[PDB]
Design a protein around this ligand. Structure first.
Ligand SMILES: Cc1cn(C2C[C@H](O)[C@@H](CO)O2)c(=O)[nH]c1=O
Ligand SMILES: Cc1cn(C2C[C@H](O)[C@@H](CO)O2)c(=O)[nH]c1=O
Ligand SMILES: Cc1cn([C@H]2C[C@H](O)[C@@H](CO)O2)c(=O)[nH]c1=O
Ligand SMILES: Cc1cn([C@H]2C[C@H](O)[C@@H](CO)O2)c(=O)[nH]c1=O
Ligand SMILES: Cc1cn([C@H]2C[C@H](O)[C@@H](CO)O2)c(=O)[nH]c1=O
Ligand SMILES: Cc1cn([C@H]2C[C@H](O)[C@@H](CO)O2)c(=O)[nH]c1=O
Ligand SMILES: [K+]
Ligand SMILES: [K+]
Ligand SMILES: [K+]
Lengths: 250, 250, 250, 250, 250, 250
C-alpha cells in the first residue's frame, strides 16, 4: 500500500482522477453500484474505497467518516494517489423553514465552524466550492428534476452543541454557540453538516476541485433529531445527482 | 433625499433592482453610456449615481470609492432604495504568473483582509459571491471572447502593506503581512483588490445577490505599480462583460 | 505624477510638510479658502488636493474619502511626497448625552473598529494621536471659544452596523456589535467616526504626527441620522479650529 | 434505538457506566475479548460497540473513528445512555527523542489543536484528564511493567499539516503550523494524536471522568510515517493497561 | 546578588530544589516556621524569601505577590537559582455551592484568564499541574484529614471584573466576562484565584514541576467579599498540607 | 477597614482625590517625604500607603507591586475610597538607541501586552493616558530641566519573555514574542514596563484620570539587565517630576 490510512496503491485507481466521497462507509457500495464495473478496493477504519466506471472512465468512491479530521485524511491520501476532483455527497439538517425534507442542497461555500480548515488556510480564506463542480451539481440536480437550493452551509465540528442542539446529556451549549443557529438563519445559511468546511478549504487552497451536495433529512425549525422513515428515500435522490454531476466533470 | 449619503430617493431608481457598482466615480457615466437613456441622478462625496436602461428595464450605476467602508455605505443605501442585485466591476493586480494584463477575473469568493465584512458576519462566514451572478459573469465573459480566470481573490483594507507592497514611504510591512503574498499565491489566490470582501460578505449575509468582476492592469510577479499605457484598454473589456452579465440577471 | 492615486508630484507641494485631510472632497476648497494663495492641485477618485499658504508656508489640503482604506492611501502617498503632519477634520455622531450638536471633539486615541490599522500595527498597539497635534487642536479650540470635549473615539469600518444603527435594510446588527454602543458609552467614548483609527495607527507607528478633530452633527442618544439644517454651521466651526491648529504646528 | 448514531438503547448497556473508547473499529472486539462475556452490540458508520464484563460489572467498548467530531458524537451518545467514565486507548507518534516505539504514554492534559473542544469550552479551558483516571492508568501501566511517560499531548485536527508532516501532496504547511513541532518539543509535549483534546475538554466541562492512554508506533524525530512491523506488538501493550485501569475505576 | 529582583545568590539556597510559594509575603515566615532551621534570606518588593529544612534537606519559601507577572518573576529567578519544584499555597473563593469555607482545593489545571501564561505558551497549551505534585498534595490532604476537592480552577488577572464581582467602583463588568462565573460553574470549575494559570503554564512548558493548593475563604454563591473571622483558621489548614506535600516530593 | 486588600478607610484619605502610585513599596515613603506632613497609613502585601500634603491638600502615595493584576487591585480600591486621579511613577528599560539611562519617559498610550486591561475593555480600546495628566507630566519634566521623551510604551505581563529577554533559565522566547522587540522598535515604541497598559485602560474606560512617567535604568540595545550603580540617581529624577505634576493636577 502507498498511503498510510486508505490502504490503496496508485495502481488501484487505474488513472482515476475524480472521487465521490460519502461520509458513511455503508453508502460506498450503494453509490458504486450506480456505475459500471463496481469493484471493492479496500476497507480500513472508516475508509471504504470502491472503484467503478463512468462513461468508460475510472471513478473512485471513498468514505470519509464523520467530520473534518478523517475527511482531511481521505482527501489528502486520495490526492497523493492522483485524485484531483472531489464530490461530496452528504446528509444534512436544514435550518430554513422553506427547505423541506427531501430537498437537495448544493453548497457554494461554508461557514467554517471546524478545526481542520485552519490547518490548511487562515480563517479569512473562503471555504468556497469549485465553480465547475458547483455548476455540475446544480445542473445535474436540474436534469433529474429534484427541488434544489443553492447557498451557504454551516459546517460544524460537532453534531450537538455547534449545531445548537439542546436535547443532550448536559443540555447546555457553550456561550459561543448560544443563539448561533438564529444568526445563521438570519444570514440565510441553509443547513448544518460537518465536513464541507474542511473539504472545501483544503481543496480550494491546494488547487483541487471540490463540490458539495446533500439530502435534507430533518428541518431544524421543527425537530432536533431526524425520523428514520424517509431518510433512505432522500439519500437515493442526492446520490443520483452526484453521480450525474461526476459524469459532467469527467 | 431618502438616504443619508447617496442623495437619492426611491423614486429616482424607477423600480430598478440591479446596480453596477464601479469604484471610481469617473467610470460611472462611462458605464451608463453603454446602456439606453443614461441620466445622471446624483453626485455626493465619492458616490456618483446614474440611471440607465437595459432591455427596457431600469438599472443603476453607482460608484463605491476605494475600500470596504464606503462600499458598505453605497450598498446599504442602494438596498434601502430597493436594489437587490449588485455587480462589482473593478481593476486588480494579478499575483499568479499565468494571469496576464488584460485578462478578466471572475471572483467566486474572497479572502477577508478587510474590516467591514466583520461588521456583517464573523470571519468564519464565507465571503462568497452569488451563484447566479457568478454564472452570469462567467458566461458573459465567454460570449465576448475575453480570456478569463475564475477563482478566489484576496481583498485587502490597504493598497500598500496588506498587498505586501514594499516600495513605500516606510518600506516595511507589518509582521502579519510579511510573506503573505507568497502564501496567497500558493493557495492559488488570483489577485488583490479592496472591496469584494465587504461587498460579498454583506450581501451573502443579507439575502442580496452580488457578483464581482475585474480587469487585470498589473501583474505583481513583475511590478508593484501599474503602467498607465494599457490601463484603459482593459477597463473597457471588463465593463463590457459586467453590462452583459447584468442583461442576463434582469 | 509621482504617486499612483493622488496624481501629485513632490514639486506640487512646494516643500509642504503639513496636510489638512478632510473626508469629503467638496470640503477641500472650502478649507483651502480660509488660507492664502489657494490653488487646486489635483482631483482623482475621492482624492482632491489643494495647496494654500499659512503664515507664508505651504500647506496641503487633501480629501480621504470615507473610511480607513482610502485614508490609508491618501496618507501613504502624501508621506511619500513629504508630508509629516496630518490633521484630520471630520464630522461625527456623539454617543454621550452631554455632548451637543455643534460641539467640537478632539480625539486623544481611538477604539480600533477598523481593518486598515491592523495592516500597520497589531490590535494591541494604541491608536493614539500625536501629543503636539492634540495640544494644538485643544488650544486652537480654546482660542476660538468653541465648546470642546477631549477624549477617546470609536472609529468604525461601517456607518451602519458597527455604529449599531438599526434603521437599516436588514435591521439586524451582527452579534459582535449588539449592545456595543452602550458599552462604548459606559467606557466614556465620545463618538463614532470612520477614519481616525486608521489615520492615528498608521501615523503613530511610522513616526508621523497626526491629530484628529470633528464637529458633532448628531447625538445618537436622540437620533440615528442627522438633520440637514445645522450640519453646515458646525462644519464651519471645526474647520476654523483645524486651520488654527495647523498655524500652531508649522 | 435510543441515540441517533450509535444504534444503542439504554438497555443494551445493562447499567454499564464505563466505556473503553478505541479509535479504530477493528480494535473493538480485540479489546472486548480481554474481558468476560464479550458481546457485539452494534455497528454503524465508524461506531462499533461491544459489551463485556469486568469483575462481574458491565463495561462498554466503543470506537470513535478518527478525530474530534466523531469522538464528540460517540461520547455524547454514550453519556446519554449512562456512561460516566471514558477511557481512551490510542496510537500516537512521539515527538521527544527519548520516547521509544513501544513506550506507553499517559496524558495529563492536551494542547488543543482541534475544533470540537471549542464547542464545549473556550480555548482558555484546560483540556485536562480526570485525576482518578490518570492515576488508574499510571498505576495500571506500572503493574504490567510497561515503560511509561506521563505528560502533555498535542491533539491535532489533522494527521498531516497540523502535525507538521511535509511528505504530503502539496508539501507545504500553513504558516500557523510551520515550526510548530519544534515549539511543542521545547515545551516538553510528548506526542501527537487526534482525539484527546475533544475527549478531555468535553468531559472535563460536563462532569464526566476521562482518561487517555496510547502506544507509541513512530518517533517523529526519525520518520514521518510508521513502519507496519511492530505496530501490533505496541497496540497489545496499551490495551492491556487500559483494561486494567478500567478494573481499578469500577 | 545573582538575580535582578529576589536579591538571592545560588549559595543562599544551599542546593535547595523545591520552593513553597505563597502569595502574601507575611505568610512566608509563617510557613518557614513549620519546618526546621528557619532563616530569613531576603526581602525585596513583594518578594520575601526564607530557607528552612525538611527531613534534613533545604527548602525555600518565597512570596509571589498578587498575580501572574510578579509570580512569573519569582518563579523565573528561583529556577535560575536552581529550584525545580514549585508548590503554590493560596487563598481562594469557591464558586460551587457544595465547596465550603475551610475546604482545601487541589488544582489539576487552570482556566487561563491571565496574560503571563501567553508569554510562555499559546492559549491552546494546557495550564496543567505536575502529576507527582498533584498526587503529593492530594495525599498530603488525605493524611491530615482535610475535606478536599480536586479539579479545575479559574485563574484571573483581576480580583474584580474577571471574577465577575459587581460591588465595585463602576459596578459594571466588561462584556467578555458578563455571566462568565455561571459558565465556569456549569463546567464544574471549583474556584477563582490569580496565579495558578501563569505558574502552571510556565512550569509545564519549561520542564519544572508545579503543584497548586488553596484554602477556601469565601463562597461566591453567597458573598463577593470574605469575612475576616475564620480566614486565618483556613490558612493554617492548607499550609499544613503544602508542607507535608513538599516532604513527599523531596 | 473599608476595602479588602489595602486596609484603608475612606476617612484615612481625608478627602484625598489624587494618588501617586509607585510599583516598589519601599519607594512609597521616599515619595511621601517630598511632600508635607507624611504619615504612614497602611502596609499589607505589596500595598503600602502613605498620606501627605501638597499645597495644603491631601495626597495618597500607594504601591502597586509588579504587574497588572495587583495594580488593578490598588487602583480599584483607591477609587472606591475616592481617588480620581492616578499618577504612576516607574522604572523602565528603553528600547530606542537615542534614549539614555537617566532620561525621563512620559507615556501617551501603551501597547497592551497584558491580561488585566482586557478585563476592563476589549483589545481594540486604546490604553491611552489622560490628556490633563500627560500635559502635567510633560510640563513638570520641562520645569525641572529633565531630558524627556514622550510616546508609546510596550506594557508587558512578563519581565522576561514578553520583553524578549533571552538570558533566562530556558533561553527561549515563545513564538509570539520572537522578534517582537525589533517590531516595537520600528514602530517607535520607547520602552518596556509592566503596569501602564492595565493602569491606563482601566482608568480610561472608567472616567478616571491617569498619567504615566518612568525613569530609564537600562537601554535594551546594549544590555538585558540594568547595572545597580546609577539606578537610584534616575529614580530621584522621575519622582521629583511626578510630585510636581501632581501639584499641577490638584
Ligand atoms: C478570597 C479570594 C481570593 N483570591 C486570591 C488570589 C490572590 O493571590 C489573592 C488576592 O486576594 O487572593 C481570589 O482570586 N478570589 C477570591 O474570592
Ligand atoms: C529595568 C526594567 C524594569 N522594568 C519594570 C516594571 C516592573 O514593575 C519593575 C520590576 O523590575 O520594573 C521593566 O519592565 N523592564 C526593564 O527593562
Ligand atoms: C441530519 C444531520 C446530519 N448531519 C451530517 C454530516 C455528518 O457527517 C453526518 C452525521 O449525522 O450527517 C449534520 O451535521 N447535522 C444534522 O442535523
Ligand atoms: C492595480 C491595483 C488596483 N487595486 C484596486 C481596488 C481599489 O479600489 C483600487 C486602488 O487602486 O484599485 C488593488 O487593490 N491592487 C492593485 O494592484
Ligand atoms: C454623523 C456621523 C458621521 N460620521 C462620519 C465619518 C465619515 O467619514 C463620514 C460619513 O458620513 O461622516 C460617522 O462615522 N458617524 C456619524 O454618526
Ligand atoms: C502514528 C500516529 C497516529 N495518530 C493517531 C490518532 C488517529 O485516530 C489515528 C490515525 O493515524 O492514529 C496520530 O494522530 N499521529 C501519528 O503520528
Ligand atoms: K472611500
Ligand atoms: K471520523
Ligand atoms: K504583584
Amino acid at each position: 500500500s502507498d498511503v498510510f490510512h486508505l490502504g490503496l496503491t496508485k495502481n488501484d485507481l487505474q488513472g482515476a482522477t475524480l472521487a465521490i466521497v460519502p461520509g458513511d462507509p455503508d453508502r460506498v457500495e450503494k453509490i458504486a453500484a450506480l456505475m459500471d464495473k463496481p469493484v471493492k478496493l479496500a476497507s480500513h477504519r472508516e475508509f471504504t474505497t470502491w472503484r467503478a466506471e463512468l462513461d468508460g472512465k475510472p471513478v473512485i468512491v471513498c468514505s470519509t467518516g464523520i467530520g473534518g479530521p478523517s475527511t482531511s485524511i481521505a482527501v489528502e491520501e486520495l490526492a497523493q494517489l492522483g485524485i484531483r476532483t472531489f464530490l461530496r455527497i452528504g446528509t444534512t439538517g436544514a435550518i430554513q423553514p422553506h427547505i423541506n425534507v427531501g430537498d437537495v442542497l448544493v453548497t457554494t461555500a461554508s461557514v467554517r465552524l471546524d478545526g481542520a480548515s485552519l490547518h490548511f488556510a487562515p480563517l479569512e480564506f473562503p471555504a468556497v466550492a469549485d465553480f465547475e463542480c458547483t455548476t455540475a451539481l446544480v445542473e445535474a440536480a436540474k436534469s433529474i428534476g429534484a427541488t434544489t437550493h443553492v447557498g451557504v452551509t454551516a459546517s460544524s465540528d460537532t453534531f450537538y452543541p455547534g449545531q445548537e442542539r439542546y436535547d443532550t446529556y448536559s443540555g447546555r451549549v457553550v456561550r459561543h454557540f448560544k443563539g448561533s443557529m438564529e444568526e445563521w438563519q438570519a444570514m440565510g445559511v441553509m443547513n448544518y453538516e460537518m465536513e464541507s468546511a474542511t473539504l472545501l478549504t483544503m481543496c480550494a487552497s491546494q488547487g483541487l476541485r471540490a463540490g458539495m451536495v446533500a439530502g435534507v433529512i430533518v428541518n431544524r425549525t421543527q425537530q432536533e433529531i431526524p425520523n428514520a422513515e424517509t431518510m433512505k428515500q432522500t439519500e437515493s435522490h442526492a446520490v443520483k445527482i452526484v453521480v450525474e454531476a461526476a459524469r459532467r466533470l469527467l
